[PDB]
Design a binder for this molecule. Structure first.
Ligand SMILES: O=c1[nH]cnc2c1ncn2[C@H]1C[C@H](O)[C@@H](COP(=O)(O)O)O1
Ligand SMILES: [Zn+2]
Lengths: 205, 216
């Protein structure tokens, strides 16, 4: 089974958002769809469930005022009057005994800040050479850095983003055998979906 | 709401060893229908939780028998018979006997391994960044253990405290080591006024600080 979920959303305080869950690989009608909330470093909170054969819906009291479950093979969930306390990952999931399937979740950022694309800077300087790319000044979070379109994955280190003046900044490093660089070029790819950005940087001495 | 409390919050364990994770509920998880809906999930960083054990001791598809669940009423145990590098992550116990469904705080499995000194790399600001007036000088402190390390930036011998940004990765799922990147941020002007930029790290493995430097 597979439950396709958005990925990320940036919304202004007070606004309303509608997340979607696309169910496949099984009879949508056969199971009750669930929704769970996870804030960055904390545990999980249950929100509610809905029955696809009809639309009977149960919710946790804490989210009685925030969520409105509906369906279609897409299950939907709408939050409302958003605040920074709503900044979290939301998962739709079939939670029933051995039928346990989760979606990848949708990272929801409630903020007034403007979407800003990253600036990517190449970091070039034994038997191995550690190269890197500095990705700075972007918003919102969610950036993927791959090396050689992802074919170079063994020695890659991805360092989590940090806020530096209201903007995020992170880095990634790759280590290759010394004899292979600069002979062969390694290039880091940076994708920032929120701002439709895909910039490649070739590492040169 | 039934409150679930896990013990402990962090669990350091060597490869090949055994791990026991506990979970208590404020009240009995035995449904009137006879079943006890207590479950266990593993959440690997950047991934959705995945089910291991449902109804105390039955395993989900594909989960190996190194994982077993036990317990009753309000006390429950998740046992990992021989810890393997890929077991790291956070374990959550969850109940669905009562409504609403509820989850535990989580327990992070930490792998104990042999000490490893960090391999340090220093990098000067790229011309592209200089070109725009910024000047970040970065330091990668890779593959070390334990996670406790200390980094200092020195400019011409002077220790720079402000303008530094540090971020550690989570334990490596393949070699159980940690990594960290320390970034010193200056303007193009301040940077061009000095000569040597030093990245110093003090970690259990040396006594004498590990020092990487470059003279502009
Ligand atoms: O997670 C759950 N929590 C409470 N009751 C459940 C849940 N799943 C199944 N059941 C129910 C529905 C059934 O009539 C009954 C036995 O089904 P079983 O799925 O075997 O536990 O109890
Ligand atoms: Zn100086």
């Amino acid at each position: 089974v597979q439950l396709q979920q958005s990925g990320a959303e940036l919304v202004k305080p007070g606004a309303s958002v509608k997340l979607s869950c696309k169910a496949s690989g099984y009879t949508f009608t056969s199971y009750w769809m669930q929704w769970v909330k996870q804030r960055p470093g904390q545990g999980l909170e249950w929100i509610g469930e809905i029955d696809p054969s009809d639309s009977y819906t149960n919710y946790n009291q804490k989210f009685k005022g925030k969520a409105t479950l509906t369906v279609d093979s897409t299950a939907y969930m709408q939050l409302s009057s958003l605040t920074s306390e709503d900044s979290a990952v939301y998962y739709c999931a079939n939670l029933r005994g051995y039928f346990d399937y989760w979606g990848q979740g949708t990272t929801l950022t409630v903020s007034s800040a403007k979407t800003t694309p990253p600036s990517v800077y190449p970091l070039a300087p034994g038997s191995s050479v550690t190269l890197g790319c500095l990705v700075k000044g972007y918003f919102p979070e969610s950036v993927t850095v791959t090396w050689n379109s992802g074919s170079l994955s063994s020695s890659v280190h991805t360092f989590p983003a940090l806020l530096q003046s209201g903007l995020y900044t992170m880095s990634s490093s790759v280590t290759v055998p010394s004899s292979t660089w600069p002979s062969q070029t390694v290039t880091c790819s940076v994708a920032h979906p929120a701002s439709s950005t895909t910039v490649d940087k070739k590492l040169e001495p | 709401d039934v409150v679930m409390t896990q013990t402990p919050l962090s669990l350091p364990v060597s490869l090949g060893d055994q791990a026991s994770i506990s979970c208590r509920s404020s009240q009995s998880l035995v449904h009137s229908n006879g079943n006890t809906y207590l479950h266990w999930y593993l959440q690997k960083p950047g991934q959705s939780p995945k089910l291991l054990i449902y109804k105390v001791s039955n395993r989900f598809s594909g989960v190996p028998d190194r994982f077993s669940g036990s317990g009753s009423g309000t006390d429950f145990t998740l046992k990992i018979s021989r810890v393997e590098a890929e077991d790291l992550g956070v374990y959550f116990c969850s109940q669905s006997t009562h409504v609403p469904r509820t989850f535990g705080g989580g327990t992070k499995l930490e792998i104990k391994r042999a000490d490893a000194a960090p391999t340090v790399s220093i990098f000067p600001p790229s011309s592209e960044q200089l070109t725009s007036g910024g000047a970040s000088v970065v330091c990668f402190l890779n593959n070390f253990y334990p996670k406790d390390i200390n980094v200092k930036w020195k400019i011409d011998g002077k220790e720079r405290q402000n303008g530094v940004l540090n971020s550690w990765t989570d334990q490596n799922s393949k070699d159980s080591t940690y990594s960290m990147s320390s970034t010193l941020t200056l303007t193009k002007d301040e940077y061009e006024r000095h000569n040597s930029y030093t990245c110093e790290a003090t970690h259990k493995t040396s006594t004498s600080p590990i020092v990487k430097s470059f003279n502009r």
